[PDB]
Design a binder for this molecule. Structure first.
Ligand SMILES: CC(C)=CCSP(=O)(O)OP(=O)(O)O
Ligand SMILES: CC(C)=CCSP(=O)(O)OP(=O)(O)O
Ligand SMILES: CC(C)=CCSP(=O)(O)OP(=O)(O)O
Ligand SMILES: CC(C)=CCSP(=O)(O)OP(=O)(O)O
Lengths: 410, 410, 410, 410
């Protein structure tokens, strides 16, 4: 009895060879994440056919041996940014998937700014599930935050020096109910560059115009007067920032701000979790305790090869709801260069502290099946990339981002 | 929420447009037969992907409006010879389909004898399910019964006058366990023609050589004793005959002989059921009672338009097992030219005679969903083609062959 | 020995069946226009592979019999707006082809404004011939004239009442040097609608901003002076207007304005040719003599079936160059509803008076081969759609627009 | 301006990724052989589309780095057995290409004897050029020499010990007139094995039955008289033998016998050229002088790395015509394990002595363009495989077989 990815790779016709190679790589990882939490084999068929139909044709070329073919530059390896199996209370697990949609010729003179890929993905995904992709907030924010093809081409002198010209990042929530849901993030770096204005105020003026044009409530001030201090702006780098939203009924979506910090102390980092003390609550401390715990847990160890750790790379993401005056944080510790053995150890014993034993077996099973390297190699660095925490009203939001393309790094 | 055929037609890439049109026609009928008895949705996906992968690329071109493109002539309409949901007691219904594999150019000077299609289907089907296609009996009988490409091409003067140059017919048992099983039938008409010998003789000499080479027991004497007579040979058409076998472990396969009769009375038809009285048992009359029952049932009615019925077109199929010394009959009433309303009424009230009500609702559901015409048109003749009967050790074997391409006849 | 379209339809794999059917229809007409003026056979292969690769996947679905599958509404039949072999002196004939790029789902809730198709066509066409698609003027005018997806979706209440929501029309000059050249036209109807401003104003303000941003000289005053009047605006329909440009080195492109008139006398039509007397020269009357000639020629005849002709449907296109201060007209007589026999006779004897005998045989050859109907049917109306005239510095610019899908209308 | 293979790889859709990789490898070599003797560009398109359509889908999988995926074993590397530009006087050079058609699953339990690939290639090739593939001699010899699928499967115990189970080899003469011509060779090793009879006997009995059934004259006596001896049979390997024929009008085809020898002196090799003195003429010694010439030429050098040469691997091919009573030889020196620099030098100075200067530049051009390695690496062994000689009624038949997949060996 074959598995859905095996059978499908046997029977399916692929438009392009690179889609076949991406299938061989990803489809096992994806299928095992789906089949190691219980995605009904039919739903596996459905999501794998969406992956075969919508996202892989919108992934860009496959990394060859010297990644000679990768022409759309990035500080990350080619392919997905992550595969985002997340665990919450009551054994509710779900599979998520982030990709910066890359055209087959993005980063080349035929598609210098990678303009179509995101829209082709959106359109294909709406055609697959009609009525499932509401385009309101996309319509409102694409003018203010993003930059279309022609505007980027007229002002190429302004943004050429930028290394990563990323403007649209799409995350798929592959619901267990076969009803995949799109999420879009806009980094305004090219916008703030050509307009020569600060990231802060373009982001917040966009959210403000949306607030008034929509009438919906998005409390956005506290983020602003924190991210606009100077002690903050000395430690973070504001230009690794974006804000995001769900392509849904704008009465249901959210607006998440997101930025990056290189911090020395966990106390120092408490600012980002707290927006400088402004954003404080009975749960703002619940979450920060756990993140500091896992912080010194995974930073207790040494780097592979005795190289010294000077600072610690964290990422941060707040979100603002439409119906209430609330905004909540979500912290990441970047672990791209640690011991996969140590990272896995910290993950599993943190889980054990939570008592997430079902999730523990889930994690180890997904590990062994989807990522053999962590056992075949004692010195291993390539499974995990980010360990993300966030406490919400009834539980933490710990997501273990992976590189489903780690097999290419071995 | 789409259905597997809808979603799949949306996402699947088709190698050829004719495969797409055949999909649009068949896949609803096939999928509704599958989902109208309970084929689990992932099993539906599997069988529909087999149909998409194995059988549709081996079905030949799609009938256009004047059927101008059909170059592989036949007395039947293009497409499957039947789609043949079978019913047995204990609510045991299963789906099976018959096709004369036609190459995309069969019946043209590039493939004048349609040689490859069957082997390509066999090979593809074994590649899909390895170890699931045993080729023993095929290997033994392809030399004696069938005719390869080169032999048929050397002796074209001999068989050119034949209208239907059919030599290999493949039936798929689309098991509910996703494990489709191939069946092959060989009509020796071209063989008996070029060799200028009697059908009876080549058929039974082939089965005899297999009996000795294999040691297995295939009692074939009584069939020969009956089919060799003259009172039989005056009424039946001996040239619409084949023998069949399952591509399986030859310790598990069977050998079925098959022929056709134009009979006047049911009494005179009792011969074929009984091989002239030789083949007799407690069940030989059980099945005959029921076939006479439905015989006078569906023949009591008139033909559409007052055309007179002179005789009755029946088919017959005897079967010989390996482990024992037994041979059993299975009769067919052809209903290609009758009232779909009357044919349906006879089916439902015969079934309702068995008490097969679950099967009754099953039949009417498959009717309304897969065949709207029987209601949209009071005068309708195009759903059913054959009503087949056979009584085995426990229950009857009533199979309601349809034309899944009836919609093409509207 | 096959022909390129025959051989290619034999060997090529098509991504979609509709591309195959469009191939069967168009590829003969296109290939016969190419091979009926002398397009070298490998150049035929190249252009036919471009048509197979770039334009047919961007043509939208194929008209089925009741044309249910056409969801992107229009006052014209589906397919190209024309196939437009143009003739000039010295036996200089070239092939060109207009299409309103339609997405496979344009006019449906997945692509309500047909946004991507034009950009996908542009991108594919640049990928095929790198460095051959300069995007300057597209970049400048896409903001001012056209409407993107999100803007059109936010203001759907404004433009929903419009019947034809056409915003981008692409013409391919299939050069005999295998170097196809793209041309883009923008009708500002949706823009002028949502902005609730006059077509004249947005068009000329866009050209003015381009004049200042680029420094190049596009004399646009006289066109505005004439189109702004009222005696003009009572007879012409101002909303069937666009302006166009070549995707090239903007030091080489042009800007053509374009509109449509329902005129009673040729005298009263002289205005559009002359912009009310402002646009006058030695050639302004040269071209007008010839258009009045063919006007009374093809209007002297009656309509098929005795229906009366009240007015005459003409189109007009003025052009402004960059290096100089000039603007030149080009008139059209619509012949969609006339006798193909009469239309053909007028074309051939116009040519004969002009002495274009080589062009005469060219025309009749393309007729018989690509359009059999004009002979198979004495009463035929379906070959030609537009007879366009323009006299430039040396010779006339008579282009005989056809419907390469006329066979679909039979 | 691209080249046909570049443009085509850009525009063509490939059914399988392996076809794309084989395209990337072969299509440059094939196209440069075509365009380095003058194959007209549209003829290049035609042959490259045949290679894209007929032969590459019938080439088997592409060698990955460890070559795990070649499941059809062989003593040669995967891909064509050669790419075999042939040179004759009057600057008459033509391209031809040999392949053992391998199914995508040949050598696996779904296709253990690689039965279909040759017939699929034949059928496809006839469908492309109807009337261009006469199947007479194939029909006559497929029973006597070859072994079908079922016969090979019944007697698997007999031929399992054989390493190379090759039974059908197809050579394409890619005529400069776009009219490719098929050639088929049958090695009877599996036949002579299962029948347990001598190769000589089955081969010549087959040719004899064809002689009587057809009436045509194929003088085969002297070959049998020589190959039946013992002094011959001690030095030559009789099991690397086949006989071949053209799929054409059997009044035009030929029958070539073919075998292989490991010979010590050129004197002792003169036997195979001469069938032991029986086959003698004015040209029998003409060709032998030249082969001894190039023999001592390319064997005077040493092997790369000082390994000693004990004997010399030669191949031989005699040919029998239909209209006359003649049989002519054609010898081969295998150079698989020599200095590409030395092999090339011998080829070019042989040519130079022959005065084939145009052919000299042709050879060096094809070398540099299609095979860079011979210059990038001073120690190179991988361009050439066979240097074949034969002197016919006017000039020699020197064919320089290459490995068009040499780049895979780097
Ligand atoms: C918006 C995309 C591009 C990145 C964010 S993915 P996420 O898992 O952080 O989203 P949620 O926290 O689950 O709401
Ligand atoms: C052998 C094929 C080509 C036709 C016979 S199909 P069948 O339904 O009669 O086979 P069974 O009676 O079910 O065993
Ligand atoms: C701009 C496109 C969409 C329509 C105009 S095509 P055309 O033949 O009128 O262009 P030219 O007159 O040849 O310059
Ligand atoms: C018959 C095939 C499989 C191999 C022989 S190819 P060839 O070049 O030796 O054929 P010719 O000598 O040119 O006639």
């Amino acid at each position: 009895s074959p598995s859905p990815w095996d059978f499908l790779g046997r029977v399916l016709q692929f438009q392009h060879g690179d889609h076949k190679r991406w299938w061989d790589v990803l489809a096992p990882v994806f299928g095992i994440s789906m089949a190691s939490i219980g995605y009904k084999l039919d739903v596996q068929y459905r999501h794998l056919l969406v992956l075969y139909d919508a996202v892989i044709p919108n992934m860009g070329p496959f990394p060859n041996s010297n990644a000679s073919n990768i022409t759309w530059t990035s500080p990350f390896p080619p392919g997905p940014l992550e595969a985002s199996v997340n665990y919450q209370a009551g054994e509710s697990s779900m599979f998520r998937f982030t990709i910066e949609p890359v055209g087959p010729h993005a980063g080349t003179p035929a598609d210098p700014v990678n303009e179509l890929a995101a829209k082709q993905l959106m359109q294909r995904l709406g055609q697959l599930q009609p009525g499932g992709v509401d385009s309101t907030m996309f319509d409102h924010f694409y003018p203010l935050l993003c930059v279309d093809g022609p505007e980027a081409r007229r002002q190429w002198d302004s943004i050429a020096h930028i290394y990563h010209k990323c403007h649209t990042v799409t995350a798929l929530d592959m619901q267990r109910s076969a009803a995949c849901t799109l999420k879009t993030a806009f980094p305004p770096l090219l916008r703030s560059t050509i307009m020569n204005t600060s990231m802060v105020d373009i982001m917040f003026d966009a959210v403000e115009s949306f607030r008034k044009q929509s009438g919906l409530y998005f409390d956005y001030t506290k983020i602003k007067e924190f991210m606009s201090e100077e002690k903050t702006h000395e430690t973070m780098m504001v230009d690794r920032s974006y804000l995001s939203f769900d392509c849904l009924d704008p009465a249901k979506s959210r607006i998440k701000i997101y930025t990056e910090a290189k911090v020395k102390t966990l106390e120092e980092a408490y600012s980002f979790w707290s927006l400088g003390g402004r954003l404080s609550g009975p749960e703002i401390d619940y979450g920060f305790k756990i993140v500091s715990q896992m912080w010194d847990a995974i930073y207790s160890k040494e780097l592979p090869g005795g190289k010294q750790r000077e600072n610690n790379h964290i990422q941060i993401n707040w979100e603002m709801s439409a119906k209430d005056s609330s905004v909540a944080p979500k912290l990441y510790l970047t672990v791209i260069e640690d011991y996969d053995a140590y990272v896995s150890s910290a993950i599993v014993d943190l889980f054990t502290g939570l008592g997430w034993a079902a999730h523990v077996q889930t994690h180890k099973k997904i590990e062994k099946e989807a990522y053999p390297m962590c056992d075949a190699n004692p010195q291993s660095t390539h499974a995990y990339v980010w360990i993300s925490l966030a406490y919400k009203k009834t539980g933490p939001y710990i997501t273990v981002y992976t590189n489903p393309g780690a097999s290419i790094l071995e």
